[PDB]
């Protein structure tokens, strides 16, 4: 199926590639966490 | 509860499905060493829902 | 043996125990004498 | 279980962790949302209490996975709490 | 009001409500024990806060 081929494309690139991108930063997403509590 | 019931049943089942591909192994020892990692959480999550 | 696990057992007793002091009688001597009912009429 | 038993991975153990379990987070949570589906609406006469229950969980599962598994903590936390000092 | 006129709250309501005084106390102890149970199976001062 192309259904399984889709799921592993998100899990490898896209998602997990942008997980390393957000982990590089820290000060911005901490200010976003405190904005959520407001 | 049904929501937080298949939740617990899904973690055990699909983690065996991981070991049957990541390191191809269908047997009983794949099911045993899969919940070497999972069992630690399974008792801890039971005490914090309580 | 390990600390953290044993210390969570002790902290349950820090609550549970002190909770009983805020949720159980502080009275004197308990009930001991055999309970007796008392009838009482009056012919003036 | 990766950090101590296997290798450290300063930020490549938290990254490597969801690299092999994004599936069960969105498999349980998507199966949860669909199980709560018939309470949110669908039925709306025999039991009006069904609307009160399932509305506050469908809301608290969209924002408990699409947020937790991403952007806002459950990743950022483990970095600045464990690491960064002691 | 004039002399010889007091009052008393009659008469279902209440003793201590639910979203009022009670809820703060229920959620309060809920955090205290959740932190302790994320330590018997973990051992740190960082895992519980996550």
Contacts of E13 (CB under 8 A, 6+ apart): none
CA dihedral D6, D11, D12, D13 (to 10 degrees): 40
Contacts of B38 (CB under 8 A, 6+ apart): B11, B12, B15
User: What resolution does the deposited structure have, in angstroms?
Assistant: 3.2
Main-chain dihedrals φ then ψ at residue B12, nearest 5 degrees = -70, -45
Rounded distance between C-alpha atoms, residue C21 and residue D12, angstroms: 49
Chain C nearest-CA residue for E29? C15
Tell me how many helices (H) and strands (E) chain C has: 1, 0
Chain E nearest-CA residue for D84? E46
Residue D28's CB: how many other CB atoms inside 10 A?
21
| Ordered DSSP codes for D18-85 | HTTTHHHHHHHHHHHHHHSHHHHTT--SS-THHHHHHHHHHHHHHHHHTTTTTTSSSSHHHHHHHSS-
Q: How many residues does chain D have?
A: 86
Sign of CA dihedral A37, E47, B35, E33: negative
Is residue E33 within 8 angstroms of chain C, CB to CB?
yes
Are the Cβ atoms of D73 and E50 closer than 8 angstroms?
A: yes
Rounded distance between C-alpha atoms, residue E50 and residue E45, angstroms: 10
Contacts of B20 (CB under 8 A, 6+ apart): B26, B30
Rounded distance between C-alpha atoms, residue E17 and residue A29, angstroms: 38
Residues of D in contact with A33 (CB under 8 A): 72-73, 76
Residues of E in contact with C1 (CB under 8 A): none
Does residue B7 have a cis bond before it (omega within 30 degrees)?
Answer: no
Rounded distance between C-alpha atoms, residue A10 and residue D18, angstroms: 12
How far off is chain B from E40, nearest CA to CA, in Å? 8
Residues of A in contact with D82 (CB under 8 A): none
Does residue A3 have a cis bond before it (omega within 30 degrees)?
Answer: no
Contact E40, B44 (CB under 8 A): yes
Rounded distance between C-alpha atoms, residue D71 and residue A30, angstroms: 10
Rounded distance between C-alpha atoms, residue B16 and residue B35, angstroms: 8
Q: How many residues does chain C have?
A: 44
Neighbours, chain E (3 or more CB pairs < 8 A) = B, C, D
């Amino acid at each position: 199926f192309g259904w399984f081929n889709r799921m592993f494309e998100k899990s490898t690139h896209h998602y997990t590639d942008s997980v390393g991108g957000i982990l590089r930063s820290t000060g911005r997403y901490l200010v976003l966490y405190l904005i959520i509590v407001v | 509860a049904i929501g937080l019931l298949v939740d617990d049943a899904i973690v055990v089942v699909e983690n065996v499905e991981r070991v049957m591909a990541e390191e191809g192994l269908p047997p009983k020892e794949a099911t045993r060493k899969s919940m070497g990692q999972i069992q630690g959480a399974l008792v801890g999550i039971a005490m914090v829902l309580s | 043996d390990r600390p953290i696990f044993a210390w969570v057992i002790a902290i349950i007793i820090m609550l549970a125990g002190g909770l009983a002091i805020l949720k159980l009688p502080v009275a004197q001597y308990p009930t001991i004498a055999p309970p007796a009912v008392t009838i009482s009429a009056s012919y003036p | 279980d990766l950090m101590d038993k296997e290798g450290k991975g300063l930020i490549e153990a938290t990254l490597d962790a969801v690299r092999m379990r994004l599936r069960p987070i969105l498999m349980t949570s998507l199966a949860f949302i669909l199980g709560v589906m018939p309470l949110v609406i669908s039925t709306g006469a025999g039991s009006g209490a069904q609307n009160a229950v399932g509305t506050g969980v469908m809301g608290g599962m969209v924002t408990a996975t699409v947020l937790a598994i991403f952007f806002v903590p459950v990743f950022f936390v483990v970095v600045r709490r464990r690491f960064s000092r002691k | 009001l004039p002399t010889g006129v007091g009052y008393d709250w009659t008469g279902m309501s209440y003793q201590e409500r639910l979203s009022g005084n009670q809820a703060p106390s229920l959620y309060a102890i809920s955090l205290i024990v959740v932190f302790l149970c994320l330590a018997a199976l973990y051992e740190s001062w960082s895992i519980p806060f996550s």
